[PDB]
């Protein structure tokens, strides 16, 4: 007979037919999936008096355990079974209530922001309800639905109650970002932004995905703080960190200005780095989990040798600060010294006036001052062989994988900012953000500047051709620019940065997939002109949108500090060597746009940045950022069992993909990163990768490490992020 | 280890058919000329064509000058030094003859009682007793020791084979059976506490734990209130967690559901309760403690074993002829074999208990296009084990008519007209709907009238050596792989699962099973008909779980599943490695 304990708490006959129907509904249009198989694997687990919720968990998981390269459609079967379970959990039935009725109930429960009701009439919620297509829920993969349930959908943190479904999330996120638009155009903007995100064309980051529509205003997830060489500045930096990490922001810290140990910071940089570490970790569940930072400093700093080994897990405690990452800052002269097999001189910033500034802004001024101070022998200085310094850095980079590189000259010669007024002097956590900053005297110093950036991404696998990006760029820019006016700022210097420059970082996901379906690869140069073609379209259409927005709503307060303001474009300042590796011509009117920018300026000082995505791209079953996948199936752990994801359209494209370890070397990929950087305002989170088994005795030669470093330099690469080493 | 040979020169004196014919001859020697040789011919045929599988001691002994054939003994210890010593002496005696031991030592009072020093020193003693005849002190002589989950000293006892403690805290070379009932499990579900008493401080409590569940219910709650009584209180989840943890890592902390062993049993638990098992967890017989090695008031349980080869029979009515042969061959042996301890002779002549089981079940399911894990083999298992138990009962019934029932027959639930088909766990109705094909109602009456020669007939034991003889899959277990590898000084020995050629796809190899549910249901359906118990295993492949760690949630759930389907005992837990 088999009995089932219902939602409330009373038995009832088991209903095998209803279960079969739900499965049959779920399987519609899927290929290579056996309902029968899923039925057998779950029915055996049932027992007399089974809770109704656990039957759904059993069928979902049963379908999830069959996800494979051969039968990838189990991704969607399990997903739909989970959507079906979430509907019954949220609304007591499959059918979502009417939008207005739901919003009203939720605001009343304190779960949605009450301004939704103020800003929109009931008739306006009726109209918006007509934009909604709840069946779009059927288009999520299993891993996507796990993400929605884990960290997106408005839920009760303690009871585990889910209150909404994915389309309500999408419509309302549209509503809040366009709330202040004139009735004339408001709802049309809402409809088209909803469409773009619910059909995966635009990818939105976590803080926006889980927050916008709720009572919170905490959306800043990356901050850049520059430290001056004083205790007051040190403390201000520390306090700013603590503030932002309690809101979960990732930190980039420029601490290169702090004077070396032994100066007229008698005790040196490291105690202060430890302090920044504890600041970063001050809100972490145990002191490891949560809160992350990358700290930046010049390669020529007197204390550099001590600093390079800071995360070497085999030293002494007061010599080590292991739980931050580091960005070593380099320029043309340092590299030249390497090639010429010469020496590098190490100065404390304090003993070399004008030297630190020139290092970022003026390369030949740096050239002059450096050689001058190398002669002047009253100045405290250390001399080292260039090969031993680069060797040490690359060694530390190789074993931890998190000693990063920033080419400061490239960040300033090819930049949307005039390095004389607003130089770029650091990056963020993941190495794609490149914005100006100024040190603080006090946590509340209205003279300091903390850089912030709002992020999003275009899904290169959801668009059919490149002129779709016009409509999408308009939506992305205007949605994110509105957010800048919507979100809280807990530290005045950060509000300065954001309202002064209005900087955005809009990037890509699903690039590997994109190259695959165009019959191109990473490693051979076959994707060069297509990358050039693709990223030209991206940057041109982003600039156009921010330009139309400047015409509509006025340029950004500090616009006059951009190289854009002076009529200069990215197509003018890019590394010249890119001409030797791609010959795609420009397809868009960069000259009309130059003038239209000279005239009306830009709403935003930056627009583009290529960030890693991991959680975000799971939502739309996309390959992460611009990275090639490691394998066809991606495995993740969760207390709900093993979660699998199959790279998009594996069925038709398995041979088209170039999986990460199939690449003979880094050259192909570094060229694509170069070609991309031609158009990117900020930077790109590029990786270097090495399989020991491609090298004699399984040891990666330093020669190859140094060569690839110089290759990235050669093609105008601004930053180098992770180094991955294959193991096994 | 079978053929009569010179142990020292390595001379072989006989061949396999002489072994088979003569084993037939000795077991039917006392039969009347009228029928004697016909019995010999048909028993020879049955064993030489692998239909009946015989255990090692019989296979190597019967026809030789020896009379040592008992390979499993069950001894219960009372709470006194005299009983402790008697138990120890009985062990030493049987292990010098190579018997496997099951010891019930749960009655010994806890450390700190009015066994001031406690159970463990005495467990060490039983260990040394068990190992007293072992080539180095590891090789040979094995035991499982049984105790209640609610014993005051339980937390100390659960970790006894944890190889990372201190010496006087550890007794590593015995296995353990933790004894549980409905109330303990309920406490787990309800997320409540379990109270730990020493047996000595709770009169009538230990007895009820096996015989009367609602009497146990009353006394337990009573003594939980009475706060003059020495008692320890623990969270039910932490106790079960500890047990399952110890079970997971050693693989040899066992489970016995004492209520199931008594509500569904061929014995009246008021007169002769089942209170322990043997080494491998399939034997379930009554026992009584001894005052002295020679105490004619004690009872040591013994059981003679054999098996039907489910791969050598073409259909299920062949079992009639085979059951007759098996029962009569083994019942004669009971009268043929020596008994070195009087309490054991009591058990065997009083109850005449047999344990006849199966081999080649995986193979059997394979050739019927059935599998273990999906429920596809449920009605076939029901069909197969009904045939087995009905035909065994019929043979022992015809034998009772011919030679008189067993002296203590009146203590069986059989004597009262009650059958296994009356007392089985009710939840088995929700997972199989095969109807009964045999006249259980005619048999009820024919049993009410003439009784049974033997108080028990069926038990599902592991076989390893035995099934090798007839190239059979071991017992009711699915094989690990198609080829089984064994070492010997003669080189690598290989065995290929029967009819691999035609059936490789039909098999469900052990690690191909998504979980334990399918197999536990088949063990349940089997237990419906089995007199005693079954050596069932639980199995887990770490790589089917996140981070390769087996969740306690799943361990506890499967434990409760076995309980739900009337599983009496849980034996090995195997973990895949690599």
């Amino acid at each position: 007979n088999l009995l089932v304990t219902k939602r409330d708490g009373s038995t009832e006959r088991i209903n095998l037919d209803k279960i079969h129907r739900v499965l049959d509904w779920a399987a519609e249009g899927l290929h290579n999936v056996s309902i029968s198989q899923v039925e057998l694997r779950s029915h055996i687990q049932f027992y007399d008096g089974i809770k109704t919720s656990d039957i759904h968990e059993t069928i979902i998981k049963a379908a999830a355990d069959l996800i494979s390269r051969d039968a990838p459609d189990y991704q969607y079967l399990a997903a739909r079974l989970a959507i079906f379970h979430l509907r019954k959990k949220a609304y007591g039935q499959f059918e979502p209530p009417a939008l207005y009725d739901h919003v009203v109930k939720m605001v009343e429960m304190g779960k949605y922001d009450n301004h939704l009701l103020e800003d929109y009439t009931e008739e306006e919620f009726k109209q918006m309800d007509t934009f909604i297509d709840h069946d779009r829920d059927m288009t999520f993969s299993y891993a996507a639905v796990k993400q929605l349930e884990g960290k997106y959908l408005v839920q009760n943190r303690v009871t585990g109650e889910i209150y909404e479904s994915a389309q309500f999330l999408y419509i309302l996120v549209a509503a809040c970002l366009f709330s202040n638009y004139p009735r004339e155009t408001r709802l049309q903007y809402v409809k088209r932004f909803y469409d773009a995100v619910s059909t995966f064309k635009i990818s939105l980051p976590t803080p926006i995905m889980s927050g916008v529509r709720t009572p919170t205003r905490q959306f800043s997830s990356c901050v850049l703080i520059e430290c001056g060489d004083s205790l007051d500045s040190i403390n201000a930096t520390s306090s700013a960190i603590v503030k932002y990490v309690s809101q979960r922001a990732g930190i980039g810290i420029n601490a290169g200005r702090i004077r070396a140990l032994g100066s007229p910071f008698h005790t040196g940089c490291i105690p202060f780095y430890k302090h920044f570490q504890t600041a970063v970790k001050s809100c972490s569940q145990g002191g490891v989990r949560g809160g992350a930072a990358t700290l930046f400093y010049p390669m020529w700093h007197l204390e550099v040798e001590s600093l390079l080994v800071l995360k070497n897990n085999r030293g002494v405690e007061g010599n080590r600060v292991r739980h931050m990452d580091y960005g070593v800052q380099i320029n043309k002269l340092m590299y030249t010294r390497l090639l010429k097999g010469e020496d590098i001189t190490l100065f404390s910033p304090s003993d070399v006036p004008g030297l630190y500034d020139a290092f970022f802004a003026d390369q030949e001024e740096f050239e002059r001052l450096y050689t001058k101070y190398e002669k002047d022998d009253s100045i405290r200085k250390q001399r080292v062989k260039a090969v031993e310094l680069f060797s040490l850095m690359m060694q530390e980079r190789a074993s931890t994988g998190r000693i990063y590189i920033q080419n400061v000259d490239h960040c300033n010669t090819h930049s949307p900012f005039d390095p004389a007024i607003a130089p770029v002097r650091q990056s963020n956590l993941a190495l794609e953000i490149a914005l100006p900053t100024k040190p603080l005297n006090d946590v509340n110093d209205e003279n300091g500047e903390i850089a912030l950036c709002t992020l999003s991404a275009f899904n290169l696998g959801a668009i059919n051709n490149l002129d779709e990006l016009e409509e999408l760029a308009i939506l992305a820019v205007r949605a994110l620019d509105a957010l800048l006016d919507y979100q809280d700022y807990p530290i005045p210097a950060a509000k300065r940065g954001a309202m002064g420059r209005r900087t955005l970082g809009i990037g890509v996901i699903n690039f590997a997939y994109y190259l695959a379906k165009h019959g191109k690869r990473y490693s051979d140069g076959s994707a060069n002109n297509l990358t050039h073609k693709t990223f030209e379209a991206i940057q041109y259409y982003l600039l156009k949108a921010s330009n139309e927005l400047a015409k509509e709503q006025g340029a950004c307060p500090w616009f006059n500090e951009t190289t854009y303001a002076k009529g200069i474009l990215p197509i003018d300042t890019y590394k010249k060597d890119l001409d030797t590796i791609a010959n795609e011509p420009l397809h868009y009117d960069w000259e009309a746009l130059r003038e239209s920018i000279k005239t009306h300026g830009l709403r935003n000082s930056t627009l583009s940045a290529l960030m890693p995505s991991e959680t975000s791209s799971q939502i739309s079953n996309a390959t992460n950022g611009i990275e090639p996948p490691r394998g066809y199936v991606s495995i993740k752990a969760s207390k709900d069992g093993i979660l699998r994801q199959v790279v998009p359209d594996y069925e038709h494209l398995h041979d088209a993909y170039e999986l990460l370890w199939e690449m003979p070397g880094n050259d192909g990929y570094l060229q694509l990163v170069g070609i991309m950087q031609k158009f990117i305002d900020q930077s790109i989170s590029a990786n270097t990768n090495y399989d020991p088994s491609r090298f004699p005795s399984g040891k990666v030669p330093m020669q190859q490490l140094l060569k690839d470093l110089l290759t990235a330099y050669k093609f105008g690469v601004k930053t180098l992020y992770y180094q991955n080493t294959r193991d096994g | 280890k079978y053929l009569v040979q010179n142990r020292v020169t390595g001379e072989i004196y006989e061949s396999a058919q002489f072994l088979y014919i003569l084993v037939a001859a000795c077991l039917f020697s006392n039969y009347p000329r009228e029928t004697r040789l016909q019995y010999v011919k048909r028993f020879y045929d049955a064993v030489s064509t692998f239909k009946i599988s015989l255990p090692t001691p019989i296979m190597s002994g019967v026809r030789t000058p020896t009379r040592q054939f008992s390979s499993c003994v069950l001894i219960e210890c009372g709470d006194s030094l005299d009983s402790i010593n008697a138990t120890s002496s009985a062990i030493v005696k049987y292990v010098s003859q190579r018997a496997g031991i099951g010891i019930n030592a749960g009655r010994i009072r806890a450390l700190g009682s009015p066994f001031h020093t406690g159970c463990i020193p005495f467990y060490k003693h039983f260990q040394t007793a068990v190992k007293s005849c072992s080539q180095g002190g590891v090789r040979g002589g094995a035991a499982t020791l049984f105790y209640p989950m609610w014993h005051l000293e339980v937390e100390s006892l659960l970790v006894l084979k944890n190889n990372r403690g201190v010496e006087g805290n550890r007794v590593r070379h015995m296995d353990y059976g933790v004894q549980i009932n409905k109330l303990m499990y309920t406490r787990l579900l309800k997320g409540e506490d379990i109270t730990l008493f020493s047996p000595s401080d709770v009169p009538g409590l230990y007895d009820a734990f096996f015989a009367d569940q609602e009497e146990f219910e009353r006394l337990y709650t009573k003594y939980e209130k009475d706060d003059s009584i020495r008692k320890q209180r623990v969270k039910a989840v932490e106790l079960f967690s500890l047990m399952m943890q110890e079970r997971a890592s050693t693989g040899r902390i066992y489970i016995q559901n004492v209520d199931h062993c008594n509500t569904h049993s061929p014995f009246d638990p008021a007169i002769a309760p089942v209170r322990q098992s043997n080494l491998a967890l399939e034997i379930a017989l009554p026992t009584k403690p001894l005052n002295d090695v020679n105490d004619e008031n004690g009872e040591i349980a013994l059981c003679t074993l054999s098996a039907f080869n489910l791969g050598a029979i073409n259909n299920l009515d062949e079992l009639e002829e085979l059951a007759i042969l098996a029962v009569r061959a083994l019942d004669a042996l009971l009268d043929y074999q020596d008994y070195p301890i009087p309490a054991a002779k009591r058990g065997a002549m009083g109850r005449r208990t047999l344990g006849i089981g199966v081999i080649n079940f995986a193979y059997y399911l394979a050739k019927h296009g059935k599998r273990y894990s999906d429920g596809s083999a449920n009605n076939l298992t029901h069909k197969t084990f009904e045939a087995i138990q009905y035909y065994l009962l019929k043979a022992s019934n015809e034998l009772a008519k011919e030679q008189g029932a067993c002296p203590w027959f009146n203590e069986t639930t059989y004597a009262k007209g009650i059958l296994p088909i009356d007392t089985y766990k009710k939840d088995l109705d929700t997972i199989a709907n095969e109807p009964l094909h045999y006249d259980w109602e005619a048999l009820r009456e024919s049993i009410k009238t003439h009784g049974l020669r033997n108080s028990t007939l069926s038990a599902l034991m592991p076989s390893e050596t035995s099934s090798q003889i007839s190239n059979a899959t071991n017992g009711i277990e699915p094989p690990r792989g198609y080829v089984s590898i064994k070492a010997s000084k003669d080189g690598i020995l290989r065995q290929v699962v029967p009819d691999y050629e035609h059936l490789h796809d039909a098999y469900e190899l052990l690690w191909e099973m998504p979980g334990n549910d399918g197999y536990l249901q088949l063990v349940g359906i089997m237990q419906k008909f089995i007199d005693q118990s079954i050596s069932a295993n639980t199995n887990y492949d770490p790589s089917r779980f996140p981070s390769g760690k087996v969740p306690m949630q799943q361990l506890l759930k499967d434990l409760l599943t076995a309980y739900k389907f009337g599983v009496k005992t849980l034996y090995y837990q195997n973990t895949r490695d690599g």
């Binding site: 304990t5 008096g49 | 409905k182 309920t186 579900l189 949630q553 506890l556 409760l560 309980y563 739900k564």
Partner: peptide, 11 residues
């Protein structure tokens, strides 16, 4: 271990 997840089970 989850006592709520267990507690549903009927023995």
């Amino acid at each position: 271990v989850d006592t709520d997840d267990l507690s549903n089970f009927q023995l």
